[PDB]
Amino acid sequence: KAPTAEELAAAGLTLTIDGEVARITLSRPHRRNAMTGRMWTELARIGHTLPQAVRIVVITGEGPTFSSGIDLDMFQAGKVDGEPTPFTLLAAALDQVIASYQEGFLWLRRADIVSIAAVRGHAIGAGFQLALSCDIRILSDTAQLCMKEPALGLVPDLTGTQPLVELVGVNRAIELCLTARTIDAAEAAQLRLAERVVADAELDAAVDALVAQLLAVPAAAARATKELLLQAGRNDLATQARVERTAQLARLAEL
Amino acid sequence: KAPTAEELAAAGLTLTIDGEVARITLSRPHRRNAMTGRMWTELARIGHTLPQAVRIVVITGEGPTFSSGIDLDMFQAGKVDGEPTPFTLLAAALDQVIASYQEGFLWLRRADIVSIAAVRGHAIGAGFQLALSCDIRILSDTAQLCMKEPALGLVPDLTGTQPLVELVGVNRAIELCLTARTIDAAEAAQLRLAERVVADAELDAAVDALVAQLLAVPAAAARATKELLLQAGRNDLATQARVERTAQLARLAEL
Amino acid sequence: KAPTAEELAAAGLTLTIDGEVARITLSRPHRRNAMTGRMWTELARIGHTLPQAVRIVVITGEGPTFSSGIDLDMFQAGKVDGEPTPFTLLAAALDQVIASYQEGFLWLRRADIVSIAAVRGHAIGAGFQLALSCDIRILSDTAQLCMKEPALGLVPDLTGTQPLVELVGVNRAIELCLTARTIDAAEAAQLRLAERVVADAELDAAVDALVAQLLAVPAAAARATKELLLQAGRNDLATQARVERTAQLARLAEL
Ligand SMILES: CC(=O)CC(=O)SCCNC(=O)CCNC(=O)[C@H](O)C(C)(C)COP(=O)(O)OP(=O)(O)OC[C@H]1O[C@@H](n2cnc3c(N)ncnc32)[C@H](O)[C@@H]1OP(=O)(O)O
Ligand SMILES: CC(=O)CC(=O)SCCNC(=O)CCNC(=O)[C@H](O)C(C)(C)COP(=O)(O)OP(=O)(O)OC[C@H]1O[C@@H](n2cnc3c(N)ncnc32)[C@H](O)[C@@H]1OP(=O)(O)O
Ligand SMILES: CC(=O)CC(=O)SCCNC(=O)CCNC(=O)[C@H](O)C(C)(C)COP(=O)(O)OP(=O)(O)OC[C@H]1O[C@@H](n2cnc3c(N)ncnc32)[C@H](O)[C@@H]1OP(=O)(O)O
Known part of the structure; x- marks a missing residue:
């Protein structure tokens, strides 16, 4: 049973389906689409239950920021979106929880889907990893990417390391991750991190144009x-x- | 025994050898160098019988188009260039026929050869795969590349998938193949698909300059x-x- | 026991350490930092004995040339820097000697180090391979790279082949190595061989800026x-x- 719109809204997500195309929108614009454990596990549930007819999946954010990465409440011991955090736990089980989060990203590589991330403003940390997990990224000229995890004393563990290395090569991946520096849209295009960069007002049209091309095959x-x-x-x-x-x-x- | 010039001309090919350099020219300009099963198997025979002295192989087309891909007669049940088509057959054996076609491309990776594709105008489908199979591509500014197979309901099966992924990365390869879109010479250079792009009138000179550099080593x-x-x-x-x-x-x- | 400054100077090297950062300078500017067997084995000894606190290693040259590659005296039968050459030997043991040289480069990939090559002027042959062995290259606008070994009848055997292929892709790596041609700084940036290119007078500042960013993580x-x-x-x-x-x-x- 697919997650309901009500359930998804409680997890900060919207899903709509039109024929062969599914659109997933990160929908906590007041927190700049910061991500939680519940959001990752609902993403996984969406992936597992999509109708067989769906063959294109577009991931976008509400508002000016694609995603500010992990919700800073996830670094506390209290529950978030009804669910225990890694820190709740620390205060094998943790390994299982992280694996359940990774399932929210892994399915974007399925052969029967083309996944597209349409990114404006910042994509930080987990958000950068979400975009990396998609087959294709289309960036607004306002996009800024950063792998912040190491700055926080963490590693990237939401499946981002492999696609980053594939895209930019191991040497540049080292430089980006170990400085945790911000990449603007022009540099992102230059480094193959974006397949196309367009003016902010044209991002929806560019996504639609790509969808049309994919559906023609x-x-x-x-x-x-x-x-x-x-x-x-x-x-x-x-x-x-x-x-x-x-x-x-x-x-x-x-x- | 190497194929004779007469045999090669019947298969739409020319081969000339000058010392250490062999030039193979696709030679059906009235059909924009569309490729057939016989052409692929003669390419394989050329590879298998080249003199040991040959260490550079240059592939070019006659006329303004490098290759329009598979000859559309190959999608009929009648024989083409004296040989049965995949559709002749369908109306293990097919697997063996395709494998024999792939041999026309595989040998371009031999360590004792440097293979160079000199591309002007369109390189479509099988033609794009031929260029991809070479070590080096030099493009005219008139070059246009496209992986059309999926648009036709087919996959690329003439050994192109690996070099495409190596050149552009898996993410961009998905975008190119699943949209089947046309790439111009400037974009091809930007995506590493060409090692050099030159004005159309200079393509022969640029190939000659590269050959001279290779022979100096x-x-x-x-x-x-x-x-x-x-x-x-x-x-x-x-x-x-x-x-x-x-x-x-x-x-x-x-x- | 780490090599002493006196021992390193006899091998054409300087090493200084400041907290978490080690700087290795190739120091035979009158021979344009040409490399010898003794220099490679001292590089290995530096790697093996660095304090645990060191986590960034910067490799630079004295004078206008990063390195002119192997010292041409290494192609004679006499000893160089007190040590037998491959030609001394030829006039299993050779295999062991080469392996000992490769140890001078292999350690630059250690996970507990970020290695940075700061290159001005030529980096030829072994010198190009030294820069390739580092995680990150920052080039002056005066930098010129070349893989000369094949021109001399040799292969690249100082661990350069893998990072070159990773950086530029196998096809471009073939073109660069088999022509042995010189790559200027602008082309190097375009081919991912440099992570940043800066004016010659700013190379030290750019290295310092990168070090500061790395130390902040x-x-x-x-x-x-x-x-x-x-x-x-x-x-x-x-x-x-x-x-x-x-x-x-x-x-x-x-x-
Ligand atoms: C293991 C992992 O996977 C680890 C990671 O992802 S590490 C990434 C953790 N994320 C971060 O450090 C990013 C934190 N946020 C930011 O840098 C900035 O908010 C930003 C660059 C995204 C935007 O900055 P801005 O445009 O100046 O907007 P700003 O005022 O900061 O943010 C708007 C609101 O979003 C909230 N917000 C932004 N990021 C948030 C986050 N990650 N968690 C919770 N709230 C967040 C802010 O609290 C702010 O709320 P108010 O309006 O109520 O004050
Ligand atoms: C599994 C696989 O490996 C699959 C593939 O390769 S799929 C690729 C199959 N190829 C195609 O669909 C390309 C078909 N052709 C074209 O798009 C166009 O001819 C072209 C873009 C190459 C050039 O277009 P143009 O410059 O306007 O020239 P155009 O008039 O079309 O072509 C010149 C002649 O070449 C012929 N021709 C072009 N491609 C041909 C082909 N693939 N098979 C047979 N004839 C072809 C045309 O019939 C035309 O003949 P006439 O002059 O007798 O009319
Ligand atoms: C298996 C492997 O690993 C193989 C390799 O590395 S192959 C690489 C071998 N290296 C080479 O062939 C490079 C040889 N040198 C050069 O091309 C040039 O010197 C250069 C392009 C580096 C600089 O040229 P330049 O700016 O015109 O300076 P130039 O006058 O040549 O050199 C300055 C001095 O350095 C010396 N020098 C440069 N390279 C040297 C080398 N590799 N070995 C010994 N001395 C060298 C020259 O003898 C010259 O000495 P004097 O001042 O005493 O005459």
């Missing part, structure tokens, strides 16, 4: 291609060729 | 270095260092 | 993050997520 070939691309880096060439060819047999049969 | 060291570079991504650092050192023992002995 | 989180980033490329995503989470348990405990 048939769903089964889109999914099979994504699945191939995700394997390509780790396979040797001979193996990748065999996987490509195996995928085509199934496409040619359908056609 | 001794053949045995060029081959040994290429072989090291191809392993570097998949090895851990300790292993890569051991492989480097093993390669140098053999070079130092010769010197 | 706590040491334990910096080390744990570097260690995660170094694994990210080779792990699958599920594994990388498990490693991230394991690293965070230890950070959260400390906090």
Whole structure:
């Protein structure tokens, strides 16, 4: 059973679905879309229950900031959004809680989805990791990215490290993370962190244009291609060729 | 026995050899160098029979288009260039036929060759994959690249997925393939898809300049270095260092 | 026991330590910081004996050239800096000698260090490999990089091949190495070979600014993050997520 709109609103999220496209909006603009444990676990539940027809997922924020990262209340011992924090616990179980949070991000790599992050203003820490977890990022010219965790004495543990390294290379990833510095939209484009940067007023139109292009390609070939691309880096060439060819047999049969 | 010029012309290809350099030209300009099964299998035969002296291979097209991709006659049941199509068959064997086509591209990664694609106008689908299979691409400013297969309900299965991911990263590869969109020469340079972009009238000169630079480096060291570079991504650092050192023992002995 | 300043000066090196930062300066400006076997083995000894407090290492050259690569005396049979050359030997043991040289570069990848190369003028061959071995490169606008080894009939065997491929991709790495061509600072920035390029007179200030940013992030989180980033490329995503989470348990405990 998918989370209800009421349940999602209590977790700071909106979800709407129109045919093949789902839009998830981070919806705590008064806290600049700061993230909580409940928000991460509801994201996971959305992923697990999306209709089979959905093949594009767009993640956006309400207001001028994509996400200010982890809600600073998560660093206290009291419950947040009804749920215990890592600090509640510390005052195996912790490992299980973190794993449950990571499930909110992992599903954005599913082969049967194209995930798109549409980022304006800051994407800090967990928020930067959410954007990194998506297949594609479209940034407003107001976007500012930062991996703040190390500044706080923490590591990035919401699945961001792999896509960051893939995008910018290990050397630049070291520089960004170990300085915890802020990257503006122009630098983000230059470093491959954004696939497109547009004026702030055009971000919705640019997302819509991309969605239209994706929907114009048939769903089964889109999914099979994504699945191939995700394997390509780790396979040797001979193996990748065999996987490509195996995928085509199934496409040619359908056609 | 190498394919004869007559046999190659029947398959839409020219091959000339001058000392250490082989030039392969796609030669069906009236069909914008559309590719067939026979063309792919002759490419493989060229690779398998090149003289040992050849260490540079340049791939070009006749006319304004590098290649319009697969010949649309390949989507019919009739034979093409004397050979059955995948659709002839569908109306294991198919898997073997596709594997035989892939051999036309795989050999361009051989350590004892530097392969160069010199691209003007469109390189679509199989043609984009041919260019991707080469070590180096030099583009005219008129070049336009596109991975059309998914738009047609197919996957890229001519060995293009791995080099595309290596060049642009998995995230951008998803965006390019799942939108099937056209990339102009300036964007291609920006995304690392071209090592150099030059004015159309200068493409032959730029290729010649590169060939001259490659020939100025001794053949045995060029081959040994290429072989090291191809392993570097998949090895851990300790292993890569051991492989480097093993390669140098053999070079130092010769010197 | 760390090498003494006197011993290091005999090997063409200076080392100074100020709290958490070590500065290693190549110090044979009359030979444009050409490198010898003794210099490589002293670099290794510095790495092995650095105080535990050191977490940033900056590598610079004296004078206008970062390093002219291997000292051409290393291609003779006589001893250099008191030590036998590969050619002394040739006129398993050689394999052990090369491995001992590689130890001078390998340690720059240690998770408990951030290594920074500050490059002006030429970095040729072994010198290019030294810069590549560091986590971060800051280039003067006067910097010129080149992988000369293949021009000399050799391969790069001082651990440079892996970081070069990571930075520029295998295709561009082939082009650079097999032409042995010179890359200026603007192209180096464009190819990700430099994280920042600054005017020559500002290189020391830019290095100091970076050091300040690194020192502002706590040491334990910096080390744990570097260690995660170094694994990210080779792990699958599920594994990388498990490693991230394991690293965070230890950070959260400390906090
Ligand atoms: C392990 C991990 O995953 C760790 C992480 O994510 S670490 C990231 C933790 N996040 C941060 O440190 C970011 C904290 N916030 C900020 O830097 C800034 O608010 C900002 C740059 C996002 C925007 O700054 P600004 O534009 O000047 O707006 P600002 O006034 O600060 O914020 C608006 C409101 O959002 C709230 N807010 C912003 N970030 C918040 C957060 N992370 N948690 C709770 N509230 C937050 C502020 O309290 C403020 O509330 P009031 O209006 O009630 O005062
Ligand atoms: C699994 C895979 O590997 C799949 C793939 O490759 S999918 C790719 C299949 N290819 C395509 O869809 C490209 C089809 N062609 C084109 O888009 C266009 O011809 C082009 C963009 C290449 C050039 O367009 P243009 O400059 O306006 O020239 P245009 O008039 O179209 O083409 C010139 C001639 O080439 C022919 N031609 C172009 N592409 C051809 C193709 N792929 N197969 C057969 N003929 C082709 C046209 O029939 C035309 O013939 P006439 O002169 O006799 O009419
Ligand atoms: C396996 C490996 O790891 C292999 C490698 O590294 S291969 C790299 C070997 N290195 C080279 O071929 C570079 C050789 N040197 C050069 O190209 C040039 O000196 C340079 C481009 C670095 C600078 O050129 P420049 O600015 O015109 O200065 P230049 O006059 O040449 O050099 C200054 C001095 O440094 C010396 N020098 C430069 N490189 C040297 C080297 N590698 N070995 C010994 N001396 C060197 C020159 O002999 C010269 O000495 P004098 O002043 O006594 O004449």
